[PDB]
Design an enzyme around this catalytic site. Structure first.
Site, PDB file in Angstrom:
ATOM      1  N   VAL A   1      38.584  23.434  38.044  1.00 47.92           N
ATOM      2  CA  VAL A   1      38.211  22.090  38.516  1.00 47.92           C
ATOM      3  C   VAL A   1      36.769  21.804  38.112  1.00 47.92           C
ATOM      4  CG1 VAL A   1      37.736  20.627  40.550  1.00 47.92           C
ATOM      5  CG2 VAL A   1      39.784  22.197  40.507  1.00 47.92           C
TER       6      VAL A   1
ATOM      7  N   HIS B   1      33.987  43.998  23.306  1.00 54.24           N
ATOM      8  CA  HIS B   1      35.430  43.840  23.237  1.00 54.24           C
ATOM      9  C   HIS B   1      35.892  42.444  23.607  1.00 54.24           C
ATOM     10  CE1 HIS B   1      36.041  44.895  27.578  1.00 54.24           C
ATOM     11  NE2 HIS B   1      37.135  44.172  27.400  1.00 54.24           N
TER      12      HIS B   1
ATOM     13  N   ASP C   1      29.740  49.076  24.120  1.00 52.73           N
ATOM     14  CA  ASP C   1      30.502  47.861  24.422  1.00 52.73           C
ATOM     15  C   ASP C   1      29.555  46.768  24.934  1.00 52.73           C
ATOM     16  OD1 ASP C   1      32.592  46.093  24.732  1.00 52.73           O
ATOM     17  OD2 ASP C   1      33.470  47.103  26.479  1.00 52.73           O
TER      18      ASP C   1
ATOM     19  N   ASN D   1      34.891  27.152  40.854  1.00 53.56           N
ATOM     20  CA  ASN D   1      36.287  26.968  40.549  1.00 53.56           C
ATOM     21  C   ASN D   1      36.424  26.708  39.056  1.00 53.56           C
ATOM     22  OD1 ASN D   1      38.891  25.908  40.133  1.00 53.56           O
ATOM     23  ND2 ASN D   1      38.989  25.193  42.274  1.00 53.56           N
TER      24      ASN D   1
ATOM     25  N   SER E   1      36.026  41.666  32.327  1.00 51.49           N
ATOM     26  CA  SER E   1      35.262  42.283  31.241  1.00 51.49           C
ATOM     27  C   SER E   1      34.134  41.412  30.746  1.00 51.49           C
ATOM     28  CB  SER E   1      36.175  42.573  30.054  1.00 51.49           C
ATOM     29  OG  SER E   1      37.083  43.603  30.405  1.00 51.49           O
ATOM     30  N   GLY E   2      33.005  42.041  30.427  1.00 57.45           N
ATOM     31  CA  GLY E   2      31.850  41.329  29.920  1.00 57.45           C
ATOM     32  C   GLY E   2      30.898  40.854  31.010  1.00 57.45           C
TER      33      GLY E   2
ATOM     34  N   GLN F   1      41.285  43.210  34.575  1.00 58.83           N
ATOM     35  CA  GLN F   1      41.461  42.341  33.410  1.00 58.83           C
ATOM     36  C   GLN F   1      40.895  40.947  33.675  1.00 58.83           C
ATOM     37  OE1 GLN F   1      45.574  41.760  32.141  1.00 58.83           O
ATOM     38  NE2 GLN F   1      44.966  40.547  30.346  1.00 58.83           N
ATOM     39  N   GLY F   2      40.082  40.473  32.746  1.00 56.56           N
ATOM     40  CA  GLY F   2      39.473  39.155  32.885  1.00 56.56           C
ATOM     41  C   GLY F   2      38.070  39.216  33.463  1.00 56.56           C
TER      42      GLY F   2
ATOM     43  N   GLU G   1      29.664  27.717  36.926  1.00 61.46           N
ATOM     44  CA  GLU G   1      31.041  27.648  37.405  1.00 61.46           C
ATOM     45  C   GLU G   1      31.255  28.265  38.780  1.00 61.46           C
ATOM     46  OE1 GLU G   1      33.479  26.035  36.477  1.00 61.46           O
ATOM     47  OE2 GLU G   1      33.809  26.015  34.303  1.00 61.46           O
TER      48      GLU G   1
HETATM   49 CA    CA Z   1      34.432  24.263  37.515  1.00 59.71          CA
END
Ligand code: CA
Length: 223
Positions: free
Chosen positions: A57, A40, A84, A54, A177-178, A174-175, A52
Site C-alpha cells: 500500500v 545473492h 555475500d 506496508n 536476505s540482504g 526467504q525474502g 516502507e
Molecule cells: Ca508502502
C-alpha cells in the site's frame, strides 16, 4: 522473519526493500546514495524502496529510486555465500528525514552474546509460506562460532557470523536476505542464509560487516 513482531511503521528507517516488480530482498541505507545488501540478491533493474512499512500500500513515506549501480563483491562465491555483500548506488540521492535515515557502519566487530535487531518482509512461517504486508522485527543474539560450526555441515567462514536461537521458532527467512542486522546502533550483519527457517539447532548466518568497512568505503569513493 519467523517468530518476530510487527516493528511499527518507519521504526527501522534504514531498512529498504529491493523491488523488481515485487519485493525480493532487503537492504540497509548507509548514506543518501548507497545501500548495502547481499550479493545473492543481485539482479539488473533493481528499484530501491525506502520509507516502507506496508509494502503493498502507498502510505506516504515511500521513496522509490532506481539503482544506478549494483556492485557484487568480486570474491562472492555463489556456492558457499562467502563474501555475500553488494553495494547499490541510487540514481538520485534519497531525501533523508525521520522515516528515511542511514545506519552507521561498525568501528569494531560485535562479540558473541550481543543482542541485535534483524528485520524484513520475508516469510513468517517455518513450514509453508506467508509473506507479511508490514515490516517484521526480531531481537536475536550473536552466537559463538562453535555454535554455528556445530550447527551446520558447511563450516562457517571468517566472513560470517551466526545469530538467533538454537531451540527453533525465531529466525530470518526467504525474502529477508540482504537486510540488516543492527547491534548497538551499528550495522553488523547482512541477512545471508540458513538451513530452512527457524529449525532447531540451525541458526541464521550473516555476512560479518565489520570485515568489509574499508572495502565499502573504497568502493563508494571510486564509484
Ligand atoms: Ca508502502
Amino acid at each position: 522473519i519467523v517468530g518476530g513482531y510487527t516493528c511499527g511503521a518507519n521504526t527501522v528507517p534504514y531498512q529498504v526493500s529491493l523491488n523488481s516488480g515485487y519485493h525480493f530482498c532487503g537492504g540497509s541505507l548507509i548514506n543518501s546514495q548507497w545501500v548495502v545488501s547481499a550479493a545473492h540478491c543481485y539482479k539488473s533493474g533493481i528499484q530501491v524502496r525506502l520509507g516502507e512499512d506496508n509494502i503493498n500500500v502507498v502510505e506516504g513515506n515511500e521513496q522509490f529510486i532506481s539503482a544506478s549501480k549494483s556492485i557484487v563483491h568480486p570474491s562472492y562465491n555463489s556456492e558457499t555465500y562467502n563474501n555475500d555483500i553488494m553495494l547499490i548506488k541510487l540514481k538520485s540521492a534519497a531525501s533523508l528525514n525521520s522515516r528515511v535515515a542511514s545506519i552507521s557502519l561498525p568501528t569494531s566487530c560485535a562479540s558473541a552474546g550481543t543482542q541485535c535487531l534483524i528485520s524484513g518482509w520475508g516469510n513468517t512461517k517455518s513450514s509453508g509460506t506467508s509473506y507479511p504486508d508490514v515490516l517484521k522485527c526480531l531481537k536475536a543474539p550473536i552466537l559463538s562460532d562453535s555454535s554455528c560450526k556445530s550447527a551446520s555441515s558447511f563450516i562457517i567462514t571468517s566472513n560470517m557470523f551466526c545469530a538467533g536461537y538454537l531451540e527453533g521458532g525465531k529466525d530470518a527467512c526467504q525474502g529477508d536476505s540482504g537486510g540488516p542486522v543492527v547491534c548497538s546502533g551499528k550495522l553488523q550483519g547482512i541477512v545471508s542464509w540458513g538451513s530452512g527457517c527457524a529449525q532447531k539447532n540451525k541458526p541464521g548466518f550473516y555476512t560479518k560487516l565489520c570485515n568489509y568497512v574499508s572495502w565499502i568505503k573504497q568502493t563508494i569513493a571510486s564509484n
